[PDB]
Amino acid sequence: HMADQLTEEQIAEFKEAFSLFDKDGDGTITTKELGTVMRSLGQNPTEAELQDMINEVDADGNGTIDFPEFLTMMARKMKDTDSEEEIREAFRVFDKDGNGYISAAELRHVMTNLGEKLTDEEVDEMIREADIDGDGQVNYEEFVQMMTA
Amino acid sequence: FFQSIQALMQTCSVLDLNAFERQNKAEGLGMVNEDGTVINRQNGEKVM
Ligand SMILES: [Ca+2]
Ligand SMILES: [Ca+2]
Ligand SMILES: [Ca+2]
Ligand SMILES: [Ca+2]
């Protein structure tokens, strides 16, 4: 949903961008309006591709781009940036310091913040399971292949 | 009066396993809202 993907500030910024394209203010983006801003940016496209880049996001097929369609375009662009990198943030939650290894103390820190509590001994049980190298720290490579700590 | 009473009694709900099964899956998803985050919203029970 747009509320999940976009914040109030981003919606305001997109509206200003939409109004930059819509010099008329009627609420729709025509080919000439889209072509004008492209020339200001240096590009000189033809109407054949200019229509194509409109039809690619025009939902109702009226031939013009309104704000609901403009927001829907930007909502997809924000969403599809992250595809499978969600494990990177999950790794950094356990990795407080910022290096490439998860320490037992760092695993204690996240477990302390979470509801479940450890008796300072079973923390070694799952870290040695995740850490195959046996160095006492779980790196990023060990975390993605199998997640226990 | 009695036609209304009889109709009301026929619309009274009983234990529905299909509704119960749906709720168990629904509570297992753990949904949240956009503006902030709701902790397992307690919207109306659908079993009786
Ligand atoms: Ca216009
Ligand atoms: Ca349209
Ligand atoms: Ca670390
Ligand atoms: Ca290791």
From Swiss-Prot, chain A:
Ca(2+) 3 binds at D95, D97, N99, Y101, E106. The modification N-acetylalanine is found at A3. Residues 78-149 are annotated as: Necessary and sufficient for interaction with PCP4. Changing E142G: In LQT14; decreased calcium affinity; loss of CACNA1C calcium-dependent-inactivation; no effect on intracellular RYR2-mediated calcium release. (Microbial infection) Inactivated by S.flexneri OspC1 and OspC3 proteins, which specifically bind the apo-form of calmodulin, thereby preventing calcium-binding and activity. The modification Phosphotyrosine is found at Y101, Y140. Gene3D superfamilies: EF-hand. The modification N6-acetyllysine is found at K23, K96. Keywords: Acetylation, Calcium, Cell projection, Cilium, Cytoplasm, Cytoskeleton, Disease variant, Flagellum, Host-virus interaction, Isopeptide bond, Long QT syndrome, Metal-binding, Methylation, Phosphoprotein, Repeat, Ubl conjugation. Changing D131G: In LQT14; reduction in calcium affinity; not changed protein abundance; not changed structure; significantly decreased thermal stability in presence of calcium; significantly decreased RYR2 interaction; increased ryanodine-sensitive calcium-release channel activity; decreased of KCNN2 calcium-activated potassium channel activity; not changed KCNN2 expression; not changed KCNN2 location at membrane. PROSITE patterns: EF_HAND_1 (PS00018), EF_HAND_2 (PS50222). There is a cross-link at K23 (Glycyl lysine isopeptide (Lys-Gly) (interchain with G-Cter in ubiquitin)). One of its GO terms (molecular function) is calcium-dependent protein binding. GO terms for biological process: autophagosome membrane docking; calcineurin-mediated signaling; cellular response to interferon-beta; cellular response to type II interferon; detection of calcium ion; G protein-coupled receptor signaling pathway; G2/M transition of mitotic cell cycle; long-term synaptic potentiation. The modification N6,N6,N6-trimethyllysine is found at K117. The keyword Metal-binding applies. GO terms for cellular component: calcium channel complex; calyx of Held; catalytic complex; centrosome; cytoplasm; cytosol; extracellular region; myelin sheath. Its main location: cytoplasm. The modification Phosphothreonine is found at T46, T112. Homotetramer. Interacts with MYO1C, MYO5A and RRAD. Interacts with MYO10. Interacts with CEP97, CCP110, TTN/titin and SRY. Interacts with USP6; the interaction is calcium dependent. Interacts with CDK5RAP2. Interacts with SCN5A. Interacts with RYR1. Interacts with FCHO1. Interacts with MIP in a 1:2 stoichiometry; the interaction with the cytoplasmic domains from two MIP subunits promotes MIP water channel closure. Interacts with ORAI1; this may play a role in the regulation of ORAI1-mediated calcium transport. Interacts with IQCF1. Interacts with SYT7. Belongs to the calmodulin family. It is linked to Ventricular tachycardia, catecholaminergic polymorphic, 4: An arrhythmogenic disorder characterized by stress-induced, bidirectional ventricular tachycardia that may degenerate into cardiac arrest and cause sudden death. Patients present with recurrent syncope, seizures, or sudden death after physical activity or emotional stress. CPVT4 inheritance is autosomal dominant. This is Calmodulin-1.
UniProtKB/Swiss-Prot annotation, chain B:
The calcium release channel activity resides in the C-terminal region while the remaining part of the protein constitutes the 'foot' structure spanning the junctional gap between the sarcoplasmic reticulum (SR) and the T-tubule. Pore opening is mediated via the cytoplasmic calcium-binding domains that mediate a small rotation of the channel-forming transmembrane regions that then leads to channel opening. Cytosolic calcium-activated calcium channel that mediates the release of Ca(2+) from the sarcoplasmic reticulum into the cytosol and thereby plays a key role in triggering muscle contraction following depolarization of T-tubules. Repeated very high-level exercise increases the open probability of the channel and leads to Ca(2+) leaking into the cytoplasm. Can also mediate the release of Ca(2+) from intracellular stores in neurons, and may thereby promote prolonged Ca(2+) signaling in the brain. Required for normal embryonic development of muscle fibers and skeletal muscle. The N-terminus is blocked. The lineage of its organism: Eukaryota, Metazoa, Chordata, Craniata, Vertebrata. Binding of [3H]ryanodine indicates that the heterozygous channel is activated by Ca(2+) concentrations 4-fold lower than normal. Single-cell analysis of cotransfected cells shows a significantly increased resting cytoplasmic Ca(2+) level and a significantly reduced luminal Ca(2+) level. It comes from the Eukaryota. It is found in: Sarcoplasmic reticulum membrane. This is Ryanodine receptor 1. Homotetramer. Can also form heterotetramers with RYR2. Identified in a complex composed of RYR1, PDE4D, PKA, FKBP1A and protein phosphatase 1 (PP1). Repeated very high-level exercise decreases interaction with PDE4D and protein phosphatase 1 (PP1). Interacts with CALM; CALM with bound calcium inhibits the RYR1 channel activity. Interacts with S100A1. Interacts with FKBP1A; this stabilizes the closed conformation of the channel. Interacts with CACNA1S; interaction with CACNA1S is important for activation of the RYR1 channel. Interacts with CACNB1. Detected in skeletal muscle (at protein level). Fast- or slow-twitch skeletal muscle. The chain holds residues 3828 to 3875 of 5037 of the full protein. Belongs to the ryanodine receptor (TC 1.A.3.1) family. RYR1 subfamily. It comes from Oryctolagus cuniculus (Rabbit).
